[PDB]
Structure 1
Amino acid sequence: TLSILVAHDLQRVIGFENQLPWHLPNDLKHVKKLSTGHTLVMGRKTFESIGKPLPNRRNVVLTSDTSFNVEGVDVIHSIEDIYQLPGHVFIFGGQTLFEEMIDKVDDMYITVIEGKFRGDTFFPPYTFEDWEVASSVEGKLDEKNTIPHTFLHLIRK
């Protein structure tokens, strides 16, 4: 299976200045739970944003940099390389990766952040005519998680 994981706001903002525009611990937990024991593929900028590979899954970084060789990270230099990775593969960001892969993935696990943030990077437009709503679950709000959010699982029709 090849899936996208993304958190985007009401206007499909995904990032600002190489970080998330929002603080939402529950999204991080969501992503951790879904990808445990699986594979994440991310662009070079996203990797540098997190700074270190996420433990307990295979971290794959897509970059043109042939000098890239980081401990705990596997490197690829082509989109085509993604299709050679075994198991459940998650496209992990950022904008460039999402743009390159949205037409290729089986499904998408989206955290819709139900707000309007300042962004400099976006998830590409998509239509529910192309995607079946496998599930839609409202996120619980509390002291640590104060922005309304919805977890969508979309499967390509």
Structure 2
Amino acid sequence: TLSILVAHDLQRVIGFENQLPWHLPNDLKHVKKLSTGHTLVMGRKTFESIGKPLPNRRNVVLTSDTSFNVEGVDVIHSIEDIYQLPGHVFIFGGQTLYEEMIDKVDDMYITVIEGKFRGDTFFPPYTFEDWEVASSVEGKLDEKNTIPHTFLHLIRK
């Protein structure tokens, strides 16, 4: 099973200066709950923006660097290698990996951030004519989660 996992804004910004433009604990809980016990595939820059694997799932970094080695991270050097990973595999960023994979994934788990942020990286455009809305759940606003947001599960038609 091949899924996208992404948070994107009203204009499909996903990032700014190798960071997320927003901080939204609800989305981080969402990510952890979806991906615990499973597999995260991410591009090198996305991984390096964090510096350490997320516990309790397989962390897989795609890079052309043959010297790349981090404790608790598995490395792949080709897109083709993704299709050999067992279980539920989540494409986890960044822009380059989304662009490479969006036509290949079965479904997408998208947090729509209902804001317009300054960004330098983007999710690829897509149309709902290719995707069914399996579910659409509004996130609760509070003092810790102050941007409106929607959890979408889309499945390729």
TM-score range, shorter chain: over 0.9
TM-score, reference length from structure 2: 1.00
The TM-score with structure 1 as length reference comes to 1.00
Please identify runs of 4+ aligned residues in structure 1 that moved more than 4 A: none
RMSD (CA atoms): 0.3
**Residue 30 of structure 1 pairs with residue 14 of structure 2:** no
Deviations along 1:99-135, one digit per CA (max 9) or x if unpaired, are 0000000000000000000000000000000000000
1:32-51 equivalent positions in 2, closer than 5 A: 32-51=32-51
Q: CA-to-partner distance for each residue in 1:71-91, whole Å, 9 max, x for gaps? A: 000000000000000000000
Report the Cα distance in structure 2 between the residues aligned to 1:23 and 1:30, rounded to whole angstroms: 13
Structure 2 SS opposite 1:129: helix
Unaligned runs of 5+ in 1: none
Q: 1:23 Cα deviation (Å)? A: 1.1
Deviation at 1:15, TM superposition (A): 0.0
**Partner deviation per Cα, 1:40-91 (whole Å, 9 max, x = no partner):** 0000000001110000000000000000011000000000000000000000
Percent identity over the alignment?
A: 99
The 2-side partners of 1:50 and 1:111 are apart by 20
Q: Count residues with an aligned counterpart.
A: 157
SS at match of 1:93: coil
Q: Using the alignment, how far apart are the partners of 2:58 and 2:131 within structure 1? A: 27
